[PDB]
Amino acid sequence: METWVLGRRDVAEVVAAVGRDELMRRIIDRLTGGLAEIGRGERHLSPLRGGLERSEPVPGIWEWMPHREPGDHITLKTVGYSPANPARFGLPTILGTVARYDDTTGALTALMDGVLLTALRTGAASAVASRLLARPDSHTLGLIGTGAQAVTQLHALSLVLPLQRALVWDTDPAHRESFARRAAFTGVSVEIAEPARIAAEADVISTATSVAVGQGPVLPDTGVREHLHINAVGADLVGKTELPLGLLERAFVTADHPEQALREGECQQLSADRLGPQLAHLCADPAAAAGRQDTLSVFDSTGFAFEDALAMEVFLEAAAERDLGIRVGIEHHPGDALDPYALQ
Template sequence: MEPSLDILSKEDVKKCINAEVLMEKLEFALADYSKGEDGGTQQPLRLTIPVDHYKGRQFVMSAFSQRENALATKVVGFYPENKDEPTHPSDIMLYNPLNGSLQAIMDGTVITEYRTGLVSAIASKHLANPTSKILAILGSGVQCTGHFNALSLLYNFDDVRIWNINIQSAEIAAKKLGKPCRVCTTAEEAVKDADIICTVTSTSTPVLNKDWVKPGCHINSVGAVKPKWQELESDLMRSSVVYVDSKEAACQETGDIIISKCEIYAEIGEVINGQKEARWHETTVFKSVGKLSHKKYIFIKYLNKLIYLYSQL
């Protein structure tokens, strides 16, 4: 008898995800990755396929986790001009690592939304001031909501500000948060005196300048997904203590690192492992390119099965 194949829709995945459990798995994954061979993971750089004719890109990301005995591949698109479809359509395939047979196919959009915000929350837990009260989010897409929900698991913010180049989009995003927040007309206004700043944009030019950021602020940057794109001004990158999910990927994939020629102090996994210091009393930047973020444990409960995934952005 052939083994059954589980197929999980977007709604199935929503029912299965537990954010607290997922955050724990992601922290394990970050730590394991930064242990190198001792971490028991295999995670090559993602394959990038330009689809320039339709102004899109596709990424193929595979990983094996010895800890979870899980083998998975994620295929995700980047179509920033999508209106009626997700800008990051994705699917995840889970394989039996013993024989390579396909066990499950699941929608990856919800997992990506959760995972990206939760990784930023993990970085903030280690790098931000533990008394942080002011949150600023630049960008108003799904990651605006994802980052707010993830960070709210750790912090009780007194003031939340949102900015987007399209103010109507920012107003729509603010209503989704379910908590009063201020929509700002400029990025500078949004980040003034902020304790934590999240840049979740699709911009190709910097939206955050050094002079706007107060000393000791922590910044989570998840945009600038191409070598010639930037979210953060080069002076800001060079003057901050920079952490990444994957040094290998960050040095090849994001303009925030490549163009600024900043020094990378550590991978966030090295901080979790106690190998590097969490210098939260200084201005810190966590640059997430999705490489290590892709290699995250995704904990899914489906019917009577527990499926452990090691996935990617």
């Protein structure tokens, strides 16, 4: 037995061969079906993730997220949020890896990059929610925060909605000015616009910012379109929120993971009895979303491990089909199972 390692090159080759659009569509479709299975009680929500706060160079967190498929495998994503990474080190804010363990033996069976996978499934989740809750003729996307997640927010939403333009804002002028180049492949025209203009004109908004704890909101409490749908994607430290309380109190709010969102999502601001049905329920039974496209709605997205396990399965199917990756004997399996020093 050896661990199947998909390095950065192998992940790059899967995306290159399949294409960004088709790979995102596969993950959207797998996520939709998997969420529906949770909604029907055929699968379980993942347990609450855990994490470690880091104060330097700016406040961040490092988190672990398990998900078990009983009798088959266990997935663990480890992921850091380090929002000084881009300016200070040229590294992405979100840095992680995803591992798979055999449920019968405990053995580490596969290990892959989590940077691209995280961005893909985070965009995909917003696309699943926005298909349910945004107007199907939505034309104008608003983006607050134009870093890494904003790229796959725009990409995923452009595959499920007839987006013609994106109005975008970032507190860093360099980051908002560079977004049009990073977005060009989608064909969606990009225009920089202040948050009040985005609130007024967008049919759908994604907020995906590295705003600090207690420094929200990133979208002002002002006039929005009657049918606005917001993907609240930003999430890291307890106490970090992006939306104004007044808007949230007026909205139909669905969380990807209610217990997690009450701790780390926009639902931190809400009484727990104010939550709409969770996304998995909407996927299994759309009665709860019926009519909500035409009124204010918020998808409170925190991310949970089942989404990473599903996206990893999409990558592993593609990689297995193409015999990609390497095999590394990492775990020591002594020829005598009862002798740790039998370095066989």
